[PDB]
Amino acid sequence: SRRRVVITGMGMLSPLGLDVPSSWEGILAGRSGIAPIEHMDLSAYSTRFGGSVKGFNVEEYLSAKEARKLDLFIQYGLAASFQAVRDSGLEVTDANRERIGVSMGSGIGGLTNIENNCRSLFEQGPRRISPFFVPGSIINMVSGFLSIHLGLQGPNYALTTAQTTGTHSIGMAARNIAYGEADVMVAGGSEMAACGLGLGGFGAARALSTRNDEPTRASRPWDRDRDGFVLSDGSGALVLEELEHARARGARIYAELVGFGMSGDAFHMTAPPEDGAGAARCMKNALRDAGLDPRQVDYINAHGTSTPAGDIAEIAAVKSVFGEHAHALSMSSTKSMTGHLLGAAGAVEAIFSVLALRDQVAPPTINLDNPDEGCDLDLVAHEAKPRKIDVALSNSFGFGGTNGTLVFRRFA
C-alpha cells in the first residue's frame, strides 16, 4: 500500500550558481544568470546569449580520465546527483544498495558531443569518431554512471519528455518509492543544448528571444514585450526517500512530495492550447493525488517560459483550476532569472519550490514591467515576497503536449 515520500537531499548547477545555496541566493536577490555566450562564436545566429553554467569545475566531482569521456550534460547531471547524495547524508551499503535507484533525464542529451563527432565524420571519416561517442552522449548515462560510481542497484532509468523531463523524472521516481519498488531514488534532469545545433535549431523555429542587446531583460514571463524563451544549461537532482526510511536514519527532511499529475494536451507538436486545458487537467490530477482542497495551494512555480502562447495558457489554466483562489496564491517564473533549462527546468524548479517552503518566500518574476492582457494574478513582479507557504506546486509543459505537476508541502 502507498508509502509517503520526502526530500532529504538536493543538488544543482544553474546559471546563478554551482550549487543549491548560491543559486537560491541569486533567485531571492532577483539576479539574472543570462549573458552573451562565450564558449562559441554565434555571430551568424539570431540569438547569441543564454544561461551558461559559469566556472564549472568537473575536477570537484570526476577524474579528468572519466570526465573527458562525457558530454557536459552528463557532467552537470553527475555534479547535481553527487551534491544531492552528499546533502542527504545517505550511506550506501550492501544492506540497502538494491533499494536505491536513479532517474536522471534530459530533453536533448549530448548534442555538443554529437555535433563535434558529426564534424569529425564529415571532414575526416568514421575512424575519427570517439570510441566514447555513444556512452558519452546517450541520455541514460547520468543514471548509468551515477549507479556505477555509488553502487546503486535499484531501478535505473531515464525519461526524455522535452521541457517536462525533470518534473516527470521526480514524479515517477516518487511513484517507484510510493509503490515499494525502491526506498530511495536520485531523480531530476540535466541539459547542455548550447551548441550550434541547439541555438540554431530553436532559432530556426523562431522560439527564442532575440533580445541580444539586453540579455538580462530577455526572459520576461507574462510581460507584454516577451519574444520567446532563453536557452539555459544546468542540472537539478533530489534524493527522494520513503518517510519511515528517512525517520529511521534521522534524516533531515526538507519537505514532503504529496502529489504528481501528468496529462497530454493532444493539441499540437509544439504549441500549448490558448485555454491551458491540458495544464489544468494535469494540475487537477496532481491536487487529487495529494488529497488537497485547491485553496490549500499557496505558491506555484510556473513553467513561465516567456513565450507569447505558453505564458497566457498558464494564467488560463490556473484561473480554471483555482477559481477565486487564483487571486490569493502567489505564482512566479524563476525562468525570469535562470532562463529555460529544458529537461533540467523541472528539476531546478522543484528544488526552488522546496526552498520556497523552507524559507516561506515566493521568488520573484523579474522583468515583469507591463503585465500582458489577462495576466492579473499575483505574479510576484520584480521582488521576492515573504508569505505563508504550506503547499507549493511546480508545473512543466513540453513539446508533444506533455504536462507534469508536482505538489510539495511542509513536513513536521
Residues that bind ligand JMM (CB under 6 A): 18-19, 22, 60-61, 82-83, 86, 108-111, 114, 134, 137-139, 197
- CA nearest neighbour of 405 among 362, 363, 349, 366: 349
Q: Which residues pair with 7 in a beta bridge?
A: 240, 255
Cα separations (Å) of 266 from 15, 382, 398, 400?
33, 35, 12, 8
Residue 71 contacts a copy of itself per CB under 8 A = no
158 binds a copy of itself (CB under 8 A): yes
Please tell me the distance from the alpha carbon of residue 374 to that of residue 316, in angstroms, as a whole number. Answer: 9
Of residues 29, 35, 129, 253, which one binds a copy of itself by CB under 8 A? Answer: 129
The correct pick among 264, 308, 323, 374 for binding a copy of itself (CB under 8 A) is 264
**Closer to a copy of itself by Cβ: residue 27 or 335:** 335
Given a copy of itself, ligand JMM, none, residue 203, with its beta carbon under 5 to 8 Å by kind, binds a copy of itself
Which residue's CB is nearer to ligand JMM, number 83 or number 169? 83
Stretch that binds a copy of itself, among 148-156, 211-219, 316-324, 352-360 (CB under 8 A): 148-156
CA dist 199 and 180 (Å) reads 41
Query: With helix as H, strand as E and coil as C, how does 199-258 read?
Result: HHHHHHCCCECCCCCCHHHCCCCCECCCCCECEECEEEEEEEEEHHHHHHCCCCCCEEEE
Does an H or E element contain 147, and which? helix 141-150
Considering only 14-22, 57-65, 144-152, 346-354, which stretch makes contact with a copy of itself by CB under 8 A?
Answer: 144-152
The whole-angstrom separation of Cα 34 and Cα 388 is: 30
Give helix 20-29 / helix 345-359 axis angle, nearest 10°.
70
> Rounded to 5 degrees, what angle do the CA atoms 38, 138, 177 make?
110
Task: Tell me the closest approach of the beta carbon of residue 156 to a copy of itself, in angstroms.
Answer: 4
Nearest approach, Cβ of residue 79 and a copy of itself (Å): 17
275 near a copy of itself, rule: CB under 8 A: no
Cα torsion 283, 286, 287, 288: sign? positive
Under 8 Å between Cβ of 23 and 17? yes
Q: Nearer to a copy of itself by C-beta: 58 or 197?
A: 197
The answer to the question of residue 269 lying near a copy of itself (CB under 8 A) is yes
The smaller minimum CB distance to a copy of itself, of residues 52 and 103, is found at: 103
Nearest to 81 by CA among 144, 24, 171, 159: 144
In the complex with ligand JMM, the residue whose CB is nearer, 108 or 194, is: 108
Site for a copy of itself in 385-404 (CB under 8 A): 398-403
Using alpha carbons, select from 152, 156, 155 the residue that is nearest to residue 140: 156
Site membership for a copy of itself, residue 281 (CB under 8 A):
yes
Is residue 172 involved in binding a copy of itself (CB under 8 A)? yes
> Rule CB under 8 A: is residue 411 a binding residue for a copy of itself?
no
- Match 551515477 to its residue by C-alpha cell: 146
Sign (positive/negative) of CA torsion 138, 181, 282, 346? negative
| CB of 134 or CB of 243, closer to ligand JMM | 134
- Give the cell for residue 357: 517552503
Nearer to a copy of itself, 15 or 155 (CB): 155
Query: Of residues 36, 89, 151, 323, which one binds a copy of itself by CB under 8 A?
Result: 151
User: Least distance in Å: CB of 268 to ligand JMM?
Assistant: 18
Residue 126 near which of a copy of itself, ligand JMM, none (CB within 5-8 Å, type-dependent): a copy of itself
The CB-of-21 to a copy of itself minimum distance in angstroms stands at: 30
> Which is closer to a copy of itself, CB of 304 or CB of 343?
343
Q: 4, 29, 67, 156: which one contacts a copy of itself (CB under 8 A)?
A: 156
Using the 8-state DSSP alphabet, how is residue 92 labeled?
Answer: P
